[PDB]
UniProtKB/Swiss-Prot annotation:
Role summary: Acts as a guanine nucleotide exchange factor (GEF) for RHOA, RAC1 and CDC42 GTPases. Binding of APC may activate RAC1 GEF activity. The APC-ARHGEF4 complex seems to be involved in cell migration as well as in E-cadherin-mediated cell-cell adhesion. Required for MMP9 up-regulation via the JNK signaling pathway in colorectal tumor cells. Involved in tumor angiogenesis and may play a role in intestinal adenoma formation and tumor progression.
Keywords: Cell membrane, Cell projection, Cytoplasm, Guanine-nucleotide releasing factor, Membrane, SH3 domain
Name used for this protein in its record: Rho guanine nucleotide exchange factor 4
Subunit structure: Isoform 3 interacts with RHOA and RAC1, and (via ABR domain) with APC. Found in a complex consisting of ARHGEF4, APC and CTNNB1.
Example GO molecular function: guanyl-nucleotide exchange factor activity
Parent sequence residues shown: 181 to 611 of 690
GO biological process: filopodium assembly; intracellular signal transduction; lamellipodium assembly; regulation of small GTPase mediated signal transduction
Record note on domains: In an autoinhibited form the SH3 domain binds intramolecularly to the DH domain, thus blocking the Rac-binding site.
Species assigned in the record: Homo sapiens (Human)
Length: 408
């Protein structure tokens, strides 16, 4: 509670800065940090505009700052902490309204005057229902500000305001459903010089925030997915006997509901793309396309496999999808290039937790180990990690992939 500091000065102090994911981050890169919406992330390095270094219990890697919201708060001063969150919600709305204004006044208006460059179909594809969202959001912020208690901010009652606008937040569903198509059209136009100049003229005449058009257009998707995080931190600093408590709780649930649908569709849509992109990035691919059988990455990480013909240790990067487990080898001195080495079909397979000792089935020296046993046939595959927490996370991951596969 109190008056805030800048992120890099905190990280320069040795201070701990926590944030939470508003979107899932899907990734197969071992230097990047994947997470799910709602996860807590410690931010270690914010030198970059976008690609920050963060930590989870586990590890650790690069992640996009825009997928994440910083916690506002890092005797009756729990009031001050409540006020800080109320103030963040309010200013966040004010900023967002300016974004929506810049889109609608600066982009849509000019595009619509140019029937020669933009069809009505194109306008719907690119901008979606953004003008309706701008209209509801203007009203919402007004209703929000009228509830703000200047005298004593901590007393402000924000929950019922969210409740009153539930149905209006439902229109975000259509926006986010259309967003993938907006992006596709934007990429296409991005490659056309006359459109690049047009959008450049728009920018310059409206004097807009230093953000690209596709950055502007992601703005409603960030906002809807961010609310549950704001409402949870507000509730956190609201006592059960506060007038606003029950409404914030009901509103948190209502806003969770809407953002969970949006985040999931985005997650599935991105999983499909990362997979296709990852695959085409791998060297010496053999054996089919991931997307024939798979739709998401369950887990990845380094694993030692031992050869069966017989019988040596290969440290390989392993990638568990629904239904299949791929392994790859990292290039001599290009740690970001991998070479396809093989895969296994998880459908025949089942996990065998192997406690320590001598080997068995061929040889000896093995530690944080386990076997993927068939059952139908009789094949078996020895695998192991460097440290114990790693084996447990793999055992968790294998248990997670069978449970997705059951009622996929």
């Amino acid at each position: 509670g109190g008056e805030q500091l800048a992120i890099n000065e905190l990280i320069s102090d040795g201070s701990v800065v926590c944030a939470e994911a508003l979107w899932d981050h899907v990734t197969m890169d071992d230097q990047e940090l994947g997470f799910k919406a709602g996860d807590v992330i410690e931010v270690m390095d914010a030198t970059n505009r976008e690609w920050w270094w963060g930590r989870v219990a586990d590890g650790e890697g690069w992640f996009p700052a825009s997928f994440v919201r910083l916690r506002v708060n890092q005797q009756s001063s729990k009031d001050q902490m409540r006020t800080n969150v109320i103030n963040e919600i309010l200013s966040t709305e004010r900023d967002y309204i300016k974004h929506l204004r810049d889109i609608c006044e600066g982009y849509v208006r000019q595009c619509r005057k140019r029937a020669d460059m933009f069809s009505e179909e194109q306008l719907r594809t690119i901008f979606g229902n953004i003008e309706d969202i701008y209209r509801c959001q203007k009203a919402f912020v007004k209703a929000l500000e009228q509830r703000f208690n200047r005298e004593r901010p901590h007393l402000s009652e924000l929950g019922a305001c969210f409740l009153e606008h539930q149905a209006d937040f439902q229109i975000y569903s259509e926006y986010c459903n259309n967003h993938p198509n907006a992006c596709v059209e934007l990429s296409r136009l991005t490659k056309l010089s006359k459109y690049v100049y047009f959008f450049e003229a728009c920018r310059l005449l409206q004097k807009m925030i230093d953000i690209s058009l596709d950055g502007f257009l992601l703005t409603p998707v960030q906002k809807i997915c961010k609310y549950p995080l704001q409402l949870a931190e507000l509730l956190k600093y609201t006592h059960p006997q506060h007038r606003d408590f029950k409404d914030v709780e009901a509103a948190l649930h209502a806003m969770k509901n809407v953002a969970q649908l949006i985040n999931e569709r985005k997650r599935r849509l991105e999983n499909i793309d990362k997979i296709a992109q990852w695959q085409s990035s791998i060297e010496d691919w053999e054996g089919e396309d991931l997307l024939v059988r798979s739709s998401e990455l369950i887990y990845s990480g380094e694993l030692t496999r031992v050869t069966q013909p017989q019988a040596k240790s290969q440290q390989r990067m392993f990638f568990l999808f629904d239904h299949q487990l791929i392994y790859c080898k990292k290039d001599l001195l290009r740690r970001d290039v991998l070479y396809y080495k093989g895969r296994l079909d998880m459908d025949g397979l089942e996990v065998v937790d192997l406690e320590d000792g001598k080997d068995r089935d061929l040889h000896v020296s093995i530690k944080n180990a386990f076997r993927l046993h068939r059952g139908a046939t009789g094949d078996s595959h020895l695998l192991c990690t460097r440290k114990p927490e790693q084996k447990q996370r793999w055992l968790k991951a294998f248990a997670r992939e069978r449970e997705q596969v059951q009622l996929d």
